[PDB]
């Protein structure tokens, strides 16, 4: 790897600089280098890894959706034939997106998840595994769509089981996991009723636990609860 000669601490320092400069591709490459040093990641380092790749893949997903929409319109009756270029370029962006997801999944498999023993790290990484399989599922159309969807579901489910046993209902990792699993149910798994039920139960159980929290934790938890409510408003 091109980051093999850089100190772990220097990679983390530069990831933070890249974040300030909104250079998320650089940030992701620095954090990949840090993961590949082989040591476990602290809470802050996990957040840096997540921010970096979320921004990279977010740009790719937005571009893929623009290109896919143009492609679909070109395949409607009455549409003038424009050649293979739209499909080719959508395929190019799709392949790069798949590459980023495979990179993240590879870091989780080698060897972040297997070394993660605490609930906060293990749930975080399993949620990420669900998220990146979900992004693969958004573009999947072939013989492996079902298996990609099941891989996402499985990762989310293991994360949910741990989070329910080991974390309070207001924990932001638990809340963000439930939010994203609910989106999986609505957008990927054709299960809007499961999505609504999960969002509602997650919101209500967090509400009942807010009284235990400090002002700062209260602000963290209620911010994510508002996202659950925003989805429930969209879905109902």
């Amino acid at each position: 790897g091109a980051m093999g000669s850089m100190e772990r601490a220097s990679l983390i320092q530069k990831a933070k600089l890249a974040e300030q400069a909104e250079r998320y591709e650089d940030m992701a490459a620095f954090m990949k280098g840090a993961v590949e040093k082989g040591e476990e990641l602290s809470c802050e380092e996990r957040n840096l890894l997540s921010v970096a790749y979320k921004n990279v893949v977010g740009g790719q997903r937005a571009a893929w959706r623009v290109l896919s929409s143009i492609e679909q319109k070109s395949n409607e009756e009455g549409s003038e034939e424009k050649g293979p270029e739209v499909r080719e370029y959508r395929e190019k962006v799709e392949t790069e997106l798949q590459g980023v997801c495979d990179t993240v999944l590879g870091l989780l498999d080698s060897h972040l998840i297997k070394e993660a023993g605490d609930a906060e790290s293990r749930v975080f990484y399993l949620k990420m595994k669900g998220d990146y399989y979900r992004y693969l599922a958004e573009v999947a159309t072939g013989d492996d769509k079902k298996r990609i969807i099941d891989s996402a579901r499985s990762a989310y489910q293991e994360a949910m089981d741990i989070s329910k046993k080991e974390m309070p209902p207001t924990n932001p990792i638990r809340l963000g996991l439930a939010l994203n699993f609910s989106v999986f149910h609505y957008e990927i798994a054709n299960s809007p009723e499961e999505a609504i039920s999960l969002a509602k139960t997650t919101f209500d159980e967090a509400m009942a636990d807010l009284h235990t929290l400090s002002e700062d934790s209260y602000k963290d938890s209620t911010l994510i609860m508002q996202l659950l409510r925003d989805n429930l408003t969209l879905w109902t």
Binding site: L48, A52, K54, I173, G176, L179, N180, I224
Partner: peptide
Amino acid sequence: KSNSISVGEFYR
């Protein structure tokens, strides 16, 4: 689009 969240982005 439904709202999702990155835990790192939320904290960072």
